[model samples]
Target chain A: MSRSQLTILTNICLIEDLETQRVVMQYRAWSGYAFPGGHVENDEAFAESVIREIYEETGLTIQNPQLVGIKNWPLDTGGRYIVICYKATEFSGTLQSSEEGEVSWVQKDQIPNLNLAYDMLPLMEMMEAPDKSEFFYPRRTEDDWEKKIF
Target chain B: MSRSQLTILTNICLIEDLETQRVVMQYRAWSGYAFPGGHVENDEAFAESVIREIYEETGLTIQNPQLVGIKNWPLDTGGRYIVICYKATEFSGTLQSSEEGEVSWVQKDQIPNLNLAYDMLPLMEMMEAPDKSEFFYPRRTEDDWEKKIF
Candidate 1:
């Protein structure tokens, strides 16, 4: 039988405060400042994975997070890495940092001044748009790994 | 090596005439009143696959199909099935009917009057939304396979 490819599932959420116009950010152990989230475990719902991940990493329980955009790329294992992007304004919890990162509120405009994970700025830009909904980074060579929004 | 679950990648696109407000839809042999497109071939670009599928199924060469939404559900194979939903308003070609189904210009309102494949309506609904981007059906028994938009 021929070998089949795979999709590595993952999720991330953007939770912002309406009053301050700030969103919770993370100083990741894996990257610079980034959104707090994690991978999809076996048999977990997509949104649930995001919820569980946010709570686990940031102690913030994101409520009714809305899907805003997506990011995906091919992996060397003959699989694709898919990340679900979400935006949430309703969340309640005390701030606590996990091993993944330090969680706190960061101004929307100033997020760039601080160092950020790669492609995060573009991810934010895609989520901010009214028409675009996907950040497709499909090719490693054909497009020179350029980002395409659709 | 441990076995990895695969994500079945598929695509479907909606091409509409902006002036007439009617869309070119497919009455699929596999399903009724469905969009035109197909699965992602190995090593093919994602958006490119959608273009090819539309041209192959409807004989229309679509230009710059916009990603409108997405649908996904867990499969028994420990993988997920994901469909990228796109909308295209620009195209050029003569219409042709293939093994997939008959292709034609379908009235937006009249589309509902005709028989529809299951989930097509919801998929359209999600695509119409201003904020929601994903239609996640991630459970077999957990939520009775209820559709969750995120």
Candidate 2:
């Protein structure tokens, strides 16, 4: 298969602070609340992608990021996508925001009540599904949001 | 980035007919025996891609394809890849061979002796891991494979 048709992405879920009681999330004006991450650049390692994304969006340098799960994200126009989810409990640097949107720390238990970005819930759900190594979460079209089958 | 930088593929593993007793595999001159599937075309749904791939590689039209898992395969080069694994038990058309090489069905117990493809075994093993809904198996370099850590 041609690599051109595939898009590899990363999402870093950072448990905020040494207490590990809060999760760092980013809010895009368009996509709502989601984790901190972006595309995995060519010639870059998955670990490097996570570290880079976390730092770029949250201004945090995450060391030894762990892959939590892989999501087969389906595109509405066609084709499939891959999102590499990562979890990091240890990081340094002041939290900051970028084009990815506002950065905030929230308690894990309060996540469900927030207006999360459509695909963000599944990745958040993965934290509790350590044993579930693979799963599918199709992207929602504009019409799908109203159906709301979370 | 160029499309050449992004590689997305599908692997269709048919556990063979209704008795669900056998598995379909293909032998490629280059990569050895892998499942019957191929690339996802632009603007094509994952389902459409798998059905088209199965037909192209094995002359079989698969219906009701089920997603088994998503694999973020590591390449020898620095980048990562996406392999979407699908499972199907029913299909139409006589199995024919393509540039992918000879196609055949084999009993599960007999697979150990065959010169199967490098990444095929893990997908085959997933058939027995229904509950293992998600997982990751990083590809190691040939040199690293010999180190043999389970």
Candidate 3:
């Protein structure tokens, strides 16, 4: 794999009401209903990056964001992309959208009915499972990387 | 920060004698005693990359390496660098060293006597702690970036 393929990104999923089962998802112009996250910037901690991304995408000031899961997202071309997933529930500020598009709280049951983005169903399932920790999805060849999941 | 400045690396520490408490450490020409690890390849998992790096440096074939800690090593050149630390006890092969210099098993007590590398004392302490799962070290400015620690 070329040096250009090695990359790392972050994703922040806000579970608003765990008891009532509601999650805050982002609607991207490039994608559909998905978590609010982006590339981690240099000079930023992974947790800090996710928190900053959450605030930038959804205008939410969250605190004490914890890493719930990690996934090895492989790019079809020649490299592996890593996605650091974090869960944040304790946050302040009204819901708003930036360049990522509209942000809203959707019920767990309603996710299936919405225009979900990428292969996000499995990730959503991982978030709900208490025991689920990390995921490794390797797409070494073109066959495995048929559809883009960002 | 700019995109060109961000970087990520991996470190694989092998605890050879779990009962006697001996760990495989390398005395580098540049750095002093430290674990055998390197950069994560373009198309590789953290485990896979660390395994490959171990083999390349120490000529040891390891399996089932679990991530133990994550530290942010800030560079003086205006960017943040990340180090993903992993631990492996189940490995097979003759003890050998390549470009990383002399490799040997040092007792827990001997670590303090040796010419230690960088700010590695805390990392070694973390490896011994069973309850300590992960750690995040971030350096954001010139004040914190002085004196490199691998």
Encode model 3's per-residue lDDT on A22-73: one tens digit a residue.
Answer: 7788887637888888887655567667778888888888876655556665
- Writing each residue's lDDT as its tens digit, candidate 2 over B31-134 gives 77777777766544566677888888888888767665555545555445556567787788887888867888777667778887774566566544554333
Q: What shift in Å separates residue A9 of candidate 2 from its native position after superposition?
A: 3.9
- Candidate 3: CAPRI quality band: acceptable
Where is model 1 chain B poorest over a 10-residue stretch in terms of lDDT? B1-10
lDDT for each residue of candidate 1 in A1-150, tens digit (9 for 90 to 100): 222256677889999999899988998753788898899877667778899999999898988787776777776557677788888899998879888778889989899898898888888998878666678775767547788886
Candidate number achieving the greatest TM-score relative to the actual structure: 1
Q: Arrange candidates by DockQ, highest first: which order?
A: 1, 3, 2
Question: What are the per-model DockQ values?
Answer: 0.40, 0.15, 0.27
Candidates by TM-score, descending order? 1, 3, 2
Return whichever of 2 and 3 wins on DockQ: 3
* Ranking of all candidate structures by their lDDT, best first: 1, 3, 2
Error of 1 at A116 (Å): 1.4
What candidate 2 gets wrong by more than 4 Å, as runs, is A1-24, A45-48, A51-82, A85-109, A118-150, B1-20, B59-82, B88-100, B122-150
Q: Write model 3 residue lDDT over B8-115, tens digit each, in one string.
A: 555566556566687788898737887878887656666667778888888888876665546665555544565666667788888898876788889967788888
Q: Per-residue CA lDDT of candidate 2, range A6-41, in tens?
A: 455654554456585788878877377877778876
